[model samples]
Target chain A: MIRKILIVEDEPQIKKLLEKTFLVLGYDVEIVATAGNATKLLGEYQPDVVILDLGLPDQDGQEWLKSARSHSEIPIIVVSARNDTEEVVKALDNGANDYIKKPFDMPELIARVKRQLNPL
Target chain B: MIRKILIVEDEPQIKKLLEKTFLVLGYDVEIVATAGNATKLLGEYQPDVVILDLGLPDQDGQEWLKSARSHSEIPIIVVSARNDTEEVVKALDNGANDYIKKPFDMPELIARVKRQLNP
Candidate 1:
């Protein structure tokens, strides 16, 4: 049983890391480097969950977060360099289910991903 | 407007820590030493949010979490000594809005409390 995960990150290194990480973990991973591309494929790709960053080239990640939340219940978690308490609170306030600061460990990410996947 | 916050903790030291922490921040703080007492005051006290530690003497904190969730939308944040991922996730699954493990810094607790209070 495979799951789909949409990755919205602009940094190529992190983008590659996220792509490979989920793929090795047996998810059908779709990687997009810009929020513009992400918004369209959000419906087209139909991921089970999404992991995104706040610093996007085309738009602030919170914008896409609000966009996805307004239309879908798919859990969106933020993994970003934005570690300020304000950004963390704002993202959760804007409907992000979880916010993980950047330089995240894989075990924690996997646990959070599993939390959203199974939900119980 | 004065904000009311309920603290359900049994340990005297941490209970005292939580009480003094919220009071110094200018919140009307209510402290309960047991889940039994908490359930009753939840309605009578009407707090803006609740901060609970999972290590209650009378009940598993999750049970109280489920009970409170069944009745109200009042935000409940767990500041427990239960640091394991399983316990953290279970508390949230059981209806806690946030789980901050014990030995939490005062700044973080205040921030989480603010998130719940204003949210």
Candidate 2:
């Protein structure tokens, strides 16, 4: 099965890197630059899983997470620059399935995505 | 940080394999054979994550998952022989963070565990 992933990230370099990496991993990738776009994509595309960045340009990442959780159960993996334990815990408690800090290993991030979209 | 994981599996061979594999991955592992034991261990040990098997001798696996989810938010990665999409979907909807079918790759399982731990 070809799984689809929606990436909510604002950084151009990171977004491009993730897009290329997920493509290499054979997943359909949709890239969005802000939380609002992510919300819109969630209703239309409904990707298998979401690779979310907590730092967004438009809305706070946690606010988006809470909003998403209110209506959807889509697995969310938060990839963020916030390395504080409190922030990570808050994201997980909000709705994230997993949390990865910045300067993360791409291979590990792919592995995390695979974990969410487990194709039997 | 050394993270701990509880393996709730009845199959001796698979349980041993997972124990060894997680040990190799540098995680502290505690193995349990039944859902009841898993529940008890969850309270006592508070493992960082859980590798749960749906088939157990004492109780239904999904029941265990429901019970665990009611009390804790510890990440659960369910590995089961049931390959049906409905079962997988049900498990995920029932609070499992991830699900893997049987005949799984050891490396992939390890990667999934690391994904949950993210340490």
Candidate 3:
């Protein structure tokens, strides 16, 4: 099965990097620059998993997460520059399946996405 | 930090293989044969993760999982021969962080464990 992933990130470089990486990993990738766009795609794209950035242009990532959780249970993996343990725990508690800090290794990100997509 | 893992598996050979595998992965591993022991050790060992076998000698794995989920959020990775999609979805719904079928590649198991432990 070609798994679909919706990446909600603001930075063009990071978005492209993730797109290229997941494409190489054989995933159907969709990139959005804001939480609002992500929310829209969540309904239309029906991705198997989501790679989210906490720093969004339009809405707070946590707000988006809570909204997403209210509607769907699609696995959300938060990738952010906030590396504080409190923030990490907060993301997990706020509906994220996993949290990856920014400046992450691509392989590690890939492993995390694989884990969420293929939990069994 | 050397993360601790509690592996609840009944088969001795498989248990030994997992022990060796996690040890090589630089994790502190404690092996037990039953869900009953796992429940007892959960308090004392304070493991970072659990690799559970659904078929245990003393109790149903799902029963243990329910019991465990009620008490802690420590990630549980269930390894079982029950490969049906229904069973897999059931395990996830039952609070398993991840599930791996029997005859699984050790590398994939390791990756799942890593994802859970480091998540």
RMSD of each: 18.4, 17.8, 17.3
> lDDT tens string, model 1, B9-114?
9987666556655665678999999998998889899888988879999999999999999999789999888889999989989888999987666667787788
Each predicted complex: what DockQ?
0.01, 0.02, 0.01
After superposition, candidate 3 runs with Cα above 4 Å error: B1-119
Q: Model 1 has how many clashing residue pairs?
A: 0
Q: Point out the higher-scoring one by lDDT: 1 or 3.
A: 3
Model 3: lDDT equals 0.87
Label model 3 with its docking quality class: incorrect
TM-score of the second chain in candidate 1 = 0.96
Span of ten consecutive residues with least summed lDDT in model 2 chain B: B16-25
Q: Rank the candidate models, highest lDDT first.
A: 2, 3, 1
- Using lDDT as the measure, name the better of candidate 1 and candidate 2: 2
> Chain B, TM-score, each prediction?
0.96, 0.97, 0.98
For all candidates, the clash counts are 0, 0, 0
Task: Give a tens-digit lDDT track for model 1, residues A1-120.
Answer: 446788888888887777656654545677788997888879898988999889998899998899889999898989999989999999999999999998889889989998998898
